[PDB]
Short mmCIF file of N, CA, C and O in Angstrom, two decimals:
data_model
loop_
_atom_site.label_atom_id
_atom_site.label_comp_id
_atom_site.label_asym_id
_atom_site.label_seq_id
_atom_site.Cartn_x
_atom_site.Cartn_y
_atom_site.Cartn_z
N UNK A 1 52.05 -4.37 -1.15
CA UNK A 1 53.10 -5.42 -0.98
C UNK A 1 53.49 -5.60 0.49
O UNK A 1 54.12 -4.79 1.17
N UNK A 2 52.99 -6.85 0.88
CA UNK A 2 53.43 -7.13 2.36
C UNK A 2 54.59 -7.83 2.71
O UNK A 2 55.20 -7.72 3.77
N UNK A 3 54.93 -8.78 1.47
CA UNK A 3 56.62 -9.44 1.73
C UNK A 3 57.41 -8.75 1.17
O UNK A 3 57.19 -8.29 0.05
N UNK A 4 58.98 -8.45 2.14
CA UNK A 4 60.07 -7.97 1.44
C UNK A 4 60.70 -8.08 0.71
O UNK A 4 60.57 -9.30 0.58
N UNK A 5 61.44 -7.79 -0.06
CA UNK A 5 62.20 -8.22 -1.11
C UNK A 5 63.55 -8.45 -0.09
O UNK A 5 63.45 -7.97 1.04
N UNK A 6 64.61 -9.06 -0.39
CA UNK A 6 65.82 -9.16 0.30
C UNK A 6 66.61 -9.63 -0.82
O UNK A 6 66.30 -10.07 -1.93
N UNK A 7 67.90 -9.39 -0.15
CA UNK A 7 69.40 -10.11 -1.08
C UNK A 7 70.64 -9.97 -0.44
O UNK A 7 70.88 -9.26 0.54
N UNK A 8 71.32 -10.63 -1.00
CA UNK A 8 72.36 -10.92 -0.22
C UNK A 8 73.04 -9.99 0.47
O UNK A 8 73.48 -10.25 1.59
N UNK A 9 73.19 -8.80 -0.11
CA UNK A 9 73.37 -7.71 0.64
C UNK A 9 72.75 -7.23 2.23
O UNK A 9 73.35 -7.05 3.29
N UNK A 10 71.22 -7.13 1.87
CA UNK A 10 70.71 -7.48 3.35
C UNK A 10 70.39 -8.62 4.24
O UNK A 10 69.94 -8.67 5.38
N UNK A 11 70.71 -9.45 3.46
CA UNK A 11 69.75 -10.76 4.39
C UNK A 11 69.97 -11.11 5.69
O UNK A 11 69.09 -11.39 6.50
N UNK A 12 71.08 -11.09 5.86
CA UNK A 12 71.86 -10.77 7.34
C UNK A 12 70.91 -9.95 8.14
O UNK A 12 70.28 -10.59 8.98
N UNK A 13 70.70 -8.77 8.08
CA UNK A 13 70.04 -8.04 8.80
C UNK A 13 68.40 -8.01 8.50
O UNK A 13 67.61 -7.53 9.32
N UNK A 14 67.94 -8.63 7.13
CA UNK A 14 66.87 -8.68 7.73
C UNK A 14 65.92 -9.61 8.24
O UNK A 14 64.89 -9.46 8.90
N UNK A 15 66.62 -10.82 7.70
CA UNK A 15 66.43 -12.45 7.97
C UNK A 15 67.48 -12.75 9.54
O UNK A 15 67.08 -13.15 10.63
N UNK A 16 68.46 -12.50 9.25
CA UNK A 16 69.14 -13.53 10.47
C UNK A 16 69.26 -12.57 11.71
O UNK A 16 69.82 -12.84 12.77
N UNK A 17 68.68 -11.51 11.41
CA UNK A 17 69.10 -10.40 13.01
C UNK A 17 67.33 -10.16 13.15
O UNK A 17 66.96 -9.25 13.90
N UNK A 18 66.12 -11.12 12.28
CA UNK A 18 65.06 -10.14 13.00
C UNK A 18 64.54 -11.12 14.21
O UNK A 18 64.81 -12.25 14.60
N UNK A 19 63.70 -10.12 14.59
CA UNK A 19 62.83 -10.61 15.89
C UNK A 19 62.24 -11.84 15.65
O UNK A 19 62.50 -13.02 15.91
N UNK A 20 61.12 -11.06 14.92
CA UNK A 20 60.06 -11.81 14.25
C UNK A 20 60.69 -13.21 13.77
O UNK A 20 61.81 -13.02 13.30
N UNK A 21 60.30 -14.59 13.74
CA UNK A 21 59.99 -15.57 12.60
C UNK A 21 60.00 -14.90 10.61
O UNK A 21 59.04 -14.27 10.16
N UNK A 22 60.95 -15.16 9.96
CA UNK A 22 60.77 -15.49 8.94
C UNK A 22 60.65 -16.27 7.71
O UNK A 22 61.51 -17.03 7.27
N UNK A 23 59.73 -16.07 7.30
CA UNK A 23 59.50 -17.08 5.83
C UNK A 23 59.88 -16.74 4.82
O UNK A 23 59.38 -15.71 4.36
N UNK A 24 60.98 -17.48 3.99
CA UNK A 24 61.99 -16.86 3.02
C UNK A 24 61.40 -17.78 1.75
O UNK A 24 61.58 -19.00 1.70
N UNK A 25 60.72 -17.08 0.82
CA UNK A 25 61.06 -17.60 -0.08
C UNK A 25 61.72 -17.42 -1.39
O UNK A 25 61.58 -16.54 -2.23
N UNK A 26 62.56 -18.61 -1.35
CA UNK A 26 63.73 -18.65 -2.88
C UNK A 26 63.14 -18.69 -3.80
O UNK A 26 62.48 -19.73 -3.69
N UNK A 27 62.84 -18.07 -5.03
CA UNK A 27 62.24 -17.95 -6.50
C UNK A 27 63.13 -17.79 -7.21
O UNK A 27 64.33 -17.87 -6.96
N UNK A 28 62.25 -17.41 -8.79
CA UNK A 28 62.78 -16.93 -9.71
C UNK A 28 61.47 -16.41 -10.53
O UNK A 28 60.30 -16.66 -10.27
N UNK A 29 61.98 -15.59 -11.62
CA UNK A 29 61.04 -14.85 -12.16
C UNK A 29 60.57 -16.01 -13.28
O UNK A 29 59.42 -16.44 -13.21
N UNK A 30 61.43 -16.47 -14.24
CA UNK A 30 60.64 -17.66 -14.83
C UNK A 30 59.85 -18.53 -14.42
O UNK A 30 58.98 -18.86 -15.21
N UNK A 31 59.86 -19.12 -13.19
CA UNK A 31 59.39 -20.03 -12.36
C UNK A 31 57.91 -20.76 -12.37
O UNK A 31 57.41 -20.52 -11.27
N UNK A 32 57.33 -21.27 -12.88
CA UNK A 32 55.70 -21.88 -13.14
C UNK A 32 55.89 -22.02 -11.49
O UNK A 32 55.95 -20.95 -10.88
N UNK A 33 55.99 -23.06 -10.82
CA UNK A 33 55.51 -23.30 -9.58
C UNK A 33 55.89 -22.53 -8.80
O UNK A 33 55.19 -22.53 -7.79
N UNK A 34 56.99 -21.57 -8.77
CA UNK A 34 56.83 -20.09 -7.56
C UNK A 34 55.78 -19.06 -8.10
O UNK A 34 55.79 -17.95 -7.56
N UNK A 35 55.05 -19.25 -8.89
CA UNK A 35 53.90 -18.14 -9.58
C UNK A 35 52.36 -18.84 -8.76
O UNK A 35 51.37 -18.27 -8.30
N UNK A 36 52.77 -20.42 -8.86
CA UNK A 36 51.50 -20.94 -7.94
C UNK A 36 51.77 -20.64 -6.47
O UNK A 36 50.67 -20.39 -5.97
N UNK A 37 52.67 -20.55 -5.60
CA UNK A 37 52.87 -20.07 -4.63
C UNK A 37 53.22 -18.55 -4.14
O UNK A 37 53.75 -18.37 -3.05
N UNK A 38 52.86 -17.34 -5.12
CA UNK A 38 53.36 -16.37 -5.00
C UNK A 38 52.12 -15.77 -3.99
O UNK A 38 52.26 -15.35 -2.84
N UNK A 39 51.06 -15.84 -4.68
CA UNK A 39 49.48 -15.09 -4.06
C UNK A 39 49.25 -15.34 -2.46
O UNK A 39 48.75 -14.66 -1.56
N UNK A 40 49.93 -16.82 -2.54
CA UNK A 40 49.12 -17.56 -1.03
C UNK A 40 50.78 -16.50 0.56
O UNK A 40 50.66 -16.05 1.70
N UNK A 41 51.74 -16.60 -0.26
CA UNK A 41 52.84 -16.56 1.00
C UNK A 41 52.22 -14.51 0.64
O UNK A 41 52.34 -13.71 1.56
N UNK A 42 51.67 -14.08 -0.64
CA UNK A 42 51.01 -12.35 -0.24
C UNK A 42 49.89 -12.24 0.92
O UNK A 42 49.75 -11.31 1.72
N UNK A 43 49.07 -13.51 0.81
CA UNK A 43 47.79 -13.51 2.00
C UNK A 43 48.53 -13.24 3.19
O UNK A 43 48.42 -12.30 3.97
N UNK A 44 49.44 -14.41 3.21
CA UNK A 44 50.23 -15.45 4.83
C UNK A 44 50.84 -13.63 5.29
O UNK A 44 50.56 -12.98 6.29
N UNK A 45 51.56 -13.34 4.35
CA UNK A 45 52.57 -11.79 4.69
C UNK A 45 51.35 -10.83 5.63
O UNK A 45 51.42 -10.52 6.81
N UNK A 46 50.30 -10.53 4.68
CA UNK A 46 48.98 -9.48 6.01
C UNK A 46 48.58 -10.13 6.44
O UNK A 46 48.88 -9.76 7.58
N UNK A 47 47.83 -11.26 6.65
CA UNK A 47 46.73 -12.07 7.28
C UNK A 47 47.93 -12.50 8.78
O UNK A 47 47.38 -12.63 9.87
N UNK A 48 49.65 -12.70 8.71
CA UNK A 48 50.24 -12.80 9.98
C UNK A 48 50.79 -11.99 10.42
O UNK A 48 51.48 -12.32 11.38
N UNK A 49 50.82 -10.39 10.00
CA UNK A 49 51.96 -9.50 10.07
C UNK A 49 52.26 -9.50 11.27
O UNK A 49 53.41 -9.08 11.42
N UNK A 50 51.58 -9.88 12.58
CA UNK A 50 52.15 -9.47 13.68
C UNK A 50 52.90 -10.30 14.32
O UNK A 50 53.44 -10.07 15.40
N UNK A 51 52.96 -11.58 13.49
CA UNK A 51 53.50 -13.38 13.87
C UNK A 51 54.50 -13.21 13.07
O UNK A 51 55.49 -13.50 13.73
N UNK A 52 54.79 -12.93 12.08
CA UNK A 52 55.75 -13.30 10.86
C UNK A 52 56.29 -12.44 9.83
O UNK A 52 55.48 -11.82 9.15
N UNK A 53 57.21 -12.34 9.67
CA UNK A 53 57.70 -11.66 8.18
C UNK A 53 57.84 -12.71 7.25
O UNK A 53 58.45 -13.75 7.48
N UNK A 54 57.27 -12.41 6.20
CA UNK A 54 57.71 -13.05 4.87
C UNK A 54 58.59 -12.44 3.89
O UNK A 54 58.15 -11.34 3.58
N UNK A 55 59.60 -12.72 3.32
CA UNK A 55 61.16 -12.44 2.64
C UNK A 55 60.99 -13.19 1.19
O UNK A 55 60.46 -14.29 1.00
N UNK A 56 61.46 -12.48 0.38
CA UNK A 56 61.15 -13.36 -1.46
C UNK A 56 62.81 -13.11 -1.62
O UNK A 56 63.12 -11.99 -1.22
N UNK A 57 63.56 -13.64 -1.95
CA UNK A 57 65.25 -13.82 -2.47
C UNK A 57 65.06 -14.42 -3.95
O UNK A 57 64.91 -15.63 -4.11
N UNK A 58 65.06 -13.70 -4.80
CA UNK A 58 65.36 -14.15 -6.25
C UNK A 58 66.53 -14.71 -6.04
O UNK A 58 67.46 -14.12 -5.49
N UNK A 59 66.60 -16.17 -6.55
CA UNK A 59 67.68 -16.51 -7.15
C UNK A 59 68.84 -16.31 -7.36
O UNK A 59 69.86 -16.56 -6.73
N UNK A 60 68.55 -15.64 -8.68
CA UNK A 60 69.23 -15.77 -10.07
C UNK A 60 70.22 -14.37 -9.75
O UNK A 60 71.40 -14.24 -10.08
N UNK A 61 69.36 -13.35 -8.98
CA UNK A 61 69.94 -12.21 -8.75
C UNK A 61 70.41 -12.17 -7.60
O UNK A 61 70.91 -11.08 -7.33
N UNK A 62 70.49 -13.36 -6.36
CA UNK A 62 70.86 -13.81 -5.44
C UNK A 62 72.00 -14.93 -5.21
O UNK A 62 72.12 -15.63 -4.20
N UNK A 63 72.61 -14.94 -6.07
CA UNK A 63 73.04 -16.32 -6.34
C UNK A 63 73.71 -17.12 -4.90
O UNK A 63 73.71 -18.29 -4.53
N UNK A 64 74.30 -15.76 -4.27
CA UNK A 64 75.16 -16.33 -3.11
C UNK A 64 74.08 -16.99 -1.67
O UNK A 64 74.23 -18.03 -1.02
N UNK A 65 73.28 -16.19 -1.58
CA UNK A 65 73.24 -16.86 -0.59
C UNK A 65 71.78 -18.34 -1.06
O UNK A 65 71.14 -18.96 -0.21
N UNK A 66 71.67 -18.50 -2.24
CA UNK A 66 70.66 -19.43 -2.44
C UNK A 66 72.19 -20.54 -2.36
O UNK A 66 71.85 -21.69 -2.64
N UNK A 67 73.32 -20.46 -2.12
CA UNK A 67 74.46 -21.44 -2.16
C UNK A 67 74.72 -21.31 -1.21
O UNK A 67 75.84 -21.83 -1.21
N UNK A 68 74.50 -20.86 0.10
CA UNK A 68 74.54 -20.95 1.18
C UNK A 68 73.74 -21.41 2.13
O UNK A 68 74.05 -21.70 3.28
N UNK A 69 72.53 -21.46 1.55
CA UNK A 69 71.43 -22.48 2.00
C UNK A 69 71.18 -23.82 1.01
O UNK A 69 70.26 -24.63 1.04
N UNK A 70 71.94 -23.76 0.43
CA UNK A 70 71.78 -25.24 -0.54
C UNK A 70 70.53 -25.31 -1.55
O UNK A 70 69.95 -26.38 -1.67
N UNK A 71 70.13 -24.24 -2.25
CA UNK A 71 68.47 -24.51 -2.89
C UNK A 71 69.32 -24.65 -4.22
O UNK A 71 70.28 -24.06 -4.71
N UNK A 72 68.32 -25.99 -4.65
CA UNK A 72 68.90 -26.60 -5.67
C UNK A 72 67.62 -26.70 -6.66
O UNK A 72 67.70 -26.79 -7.88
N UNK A 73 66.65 -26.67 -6.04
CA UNK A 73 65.71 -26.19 -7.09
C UNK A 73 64.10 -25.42 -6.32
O UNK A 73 64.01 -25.40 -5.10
N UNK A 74 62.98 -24.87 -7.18
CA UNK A 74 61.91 -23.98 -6.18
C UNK A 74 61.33 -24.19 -7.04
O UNK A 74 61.60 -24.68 -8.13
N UNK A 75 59.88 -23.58 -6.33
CA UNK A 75 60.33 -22.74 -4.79
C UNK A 75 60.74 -23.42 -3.89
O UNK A 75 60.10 -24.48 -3.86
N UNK A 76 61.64 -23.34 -2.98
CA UNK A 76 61.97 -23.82 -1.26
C UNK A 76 61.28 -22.56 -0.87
O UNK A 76 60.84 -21.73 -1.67
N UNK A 77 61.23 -22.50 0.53
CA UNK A 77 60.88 -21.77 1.39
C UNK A 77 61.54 -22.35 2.77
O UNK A 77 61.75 -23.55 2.91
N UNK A 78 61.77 -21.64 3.52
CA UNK A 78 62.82 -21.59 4.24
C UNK A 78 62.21 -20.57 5.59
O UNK A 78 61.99 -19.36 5.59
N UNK A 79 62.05 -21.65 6.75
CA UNK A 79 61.30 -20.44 8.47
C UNK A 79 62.65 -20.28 8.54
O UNK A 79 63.53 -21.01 8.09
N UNK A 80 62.74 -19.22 9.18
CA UNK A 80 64.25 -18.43 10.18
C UNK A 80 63.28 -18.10 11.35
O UNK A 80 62.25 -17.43 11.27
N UNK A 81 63.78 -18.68 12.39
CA UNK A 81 64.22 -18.33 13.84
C UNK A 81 65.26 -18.14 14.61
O UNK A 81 66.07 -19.03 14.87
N UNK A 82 65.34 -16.72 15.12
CA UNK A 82 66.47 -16.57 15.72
C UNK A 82 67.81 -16.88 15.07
O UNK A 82 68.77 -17.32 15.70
N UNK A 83 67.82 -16.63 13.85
CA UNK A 83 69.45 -16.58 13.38
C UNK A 83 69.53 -18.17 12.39
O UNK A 83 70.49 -18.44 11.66
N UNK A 84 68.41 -18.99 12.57
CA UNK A 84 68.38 -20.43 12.11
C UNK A 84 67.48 -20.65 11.43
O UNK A 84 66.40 -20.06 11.48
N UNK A 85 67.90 -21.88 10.38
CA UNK A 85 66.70 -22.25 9.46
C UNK A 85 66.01 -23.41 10.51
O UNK A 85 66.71 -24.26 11.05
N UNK A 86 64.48 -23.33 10.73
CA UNK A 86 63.84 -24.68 11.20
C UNK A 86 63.27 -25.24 10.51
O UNK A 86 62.76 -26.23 11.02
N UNK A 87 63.05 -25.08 9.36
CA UNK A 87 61.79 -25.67 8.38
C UNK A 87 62.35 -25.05 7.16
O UNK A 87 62.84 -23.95 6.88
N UNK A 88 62.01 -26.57 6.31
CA UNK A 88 62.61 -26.50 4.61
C UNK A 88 61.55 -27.14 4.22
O UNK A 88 61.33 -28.27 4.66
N UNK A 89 60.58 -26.43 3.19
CA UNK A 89 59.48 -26.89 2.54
C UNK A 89 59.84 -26.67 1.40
O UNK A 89 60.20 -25.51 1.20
N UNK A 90 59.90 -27.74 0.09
CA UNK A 90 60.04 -27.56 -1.32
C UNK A 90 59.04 -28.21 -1.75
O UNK A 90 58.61 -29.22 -1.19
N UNK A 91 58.39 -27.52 -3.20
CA UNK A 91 57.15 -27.56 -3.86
C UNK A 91 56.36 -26.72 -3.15
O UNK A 91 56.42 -26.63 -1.92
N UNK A 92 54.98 -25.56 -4.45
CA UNK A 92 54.38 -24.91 -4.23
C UNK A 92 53.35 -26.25 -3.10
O UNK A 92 53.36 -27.48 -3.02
N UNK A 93 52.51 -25.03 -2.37
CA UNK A 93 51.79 -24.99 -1.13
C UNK A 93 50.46 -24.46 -1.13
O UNK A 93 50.43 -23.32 -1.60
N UNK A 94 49.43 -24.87 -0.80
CA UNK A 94 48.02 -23.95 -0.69
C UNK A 94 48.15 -23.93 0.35
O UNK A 94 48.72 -24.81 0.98
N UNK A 95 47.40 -22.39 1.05
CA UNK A 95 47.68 -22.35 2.18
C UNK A 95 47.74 -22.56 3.53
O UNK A 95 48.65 -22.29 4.32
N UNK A 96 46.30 -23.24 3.76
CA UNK A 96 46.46 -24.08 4.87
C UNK A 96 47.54 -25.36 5.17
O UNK A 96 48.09 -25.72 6.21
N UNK A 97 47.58 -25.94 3.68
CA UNK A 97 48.76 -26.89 3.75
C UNK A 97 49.95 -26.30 4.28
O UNK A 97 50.51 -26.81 5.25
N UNK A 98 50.52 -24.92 3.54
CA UNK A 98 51.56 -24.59 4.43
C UNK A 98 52.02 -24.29 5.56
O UNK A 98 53.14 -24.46 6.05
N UNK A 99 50.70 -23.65 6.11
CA UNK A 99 51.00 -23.35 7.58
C UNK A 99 50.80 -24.52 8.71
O UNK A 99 51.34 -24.44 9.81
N UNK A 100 50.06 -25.52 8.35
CA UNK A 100 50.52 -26.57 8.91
C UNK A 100 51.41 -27.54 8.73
O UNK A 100 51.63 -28.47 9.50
N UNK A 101 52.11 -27.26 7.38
CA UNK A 101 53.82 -28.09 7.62
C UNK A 101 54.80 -27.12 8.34
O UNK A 101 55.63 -27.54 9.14
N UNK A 102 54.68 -25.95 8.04
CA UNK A 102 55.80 -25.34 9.00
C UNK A 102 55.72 -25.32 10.42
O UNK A 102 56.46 -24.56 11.03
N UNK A 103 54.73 -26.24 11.19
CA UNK A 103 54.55 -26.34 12.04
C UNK A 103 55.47 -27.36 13.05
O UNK A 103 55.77 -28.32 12.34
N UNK A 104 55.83 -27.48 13.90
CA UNK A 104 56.48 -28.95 14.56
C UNK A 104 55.66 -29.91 15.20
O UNK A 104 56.03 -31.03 15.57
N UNK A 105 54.19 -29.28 15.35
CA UNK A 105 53.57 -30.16 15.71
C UNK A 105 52.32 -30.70 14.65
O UNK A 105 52.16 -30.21 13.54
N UNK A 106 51.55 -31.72 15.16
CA UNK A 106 50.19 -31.99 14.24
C UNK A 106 49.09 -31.87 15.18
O UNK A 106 49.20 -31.29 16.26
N UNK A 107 48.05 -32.40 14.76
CA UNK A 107 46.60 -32.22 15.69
C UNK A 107 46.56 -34.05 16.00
O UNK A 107 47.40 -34.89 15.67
N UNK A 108 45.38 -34.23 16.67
CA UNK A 108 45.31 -35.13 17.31
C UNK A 108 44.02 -35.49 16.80
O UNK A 108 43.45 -36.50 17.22
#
């Protein structure tokens, strides 16, 4: 297991105080389309470990801070930089698709 688990208890410290870039994603355990996106953000977690942390926040067992970022339905996924959200992607993702929307730029 390369992404963390987090909750409201830690998220503060391990989302909004880390170094690293993180990719948060909001689920739930019922969820059909966070089950299609679960495998690809396990690749993204080793295939970037030295670029990125990836973060999973259940929900349901999260309630507060999925109301503090406004997720109204998932998966969202959610970059943190430096203390901030920059990127809000909702609906599952294959993976090249994702890593080039969380991007700010495109190709030419």
């Amino acid at each position: 297991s390369a992404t963390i688990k987090v909750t409201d208890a830690s998220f503060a410290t391990d989302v909004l105080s880390s170094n690293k870039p993180v990719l948060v994603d909001f689920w739930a355990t019922w969820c059909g389309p966070c089950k299609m996106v679960a495998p690809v953000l396990e690749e993204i977690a080793t295939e970037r470990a030295t670029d990125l942390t990836v973060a999973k926040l259940d929900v349901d067992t999260n309630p507060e801070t999925a109301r503090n970022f406004q997720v109204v339905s998932i998966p969202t996924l959610i970059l943190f930089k430096d203390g901030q959200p920059v990127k809000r992607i909702v609906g599952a993702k294959g993976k090249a698709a994702l890593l080039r929307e969380l991007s700010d730029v495109v190709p030419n």
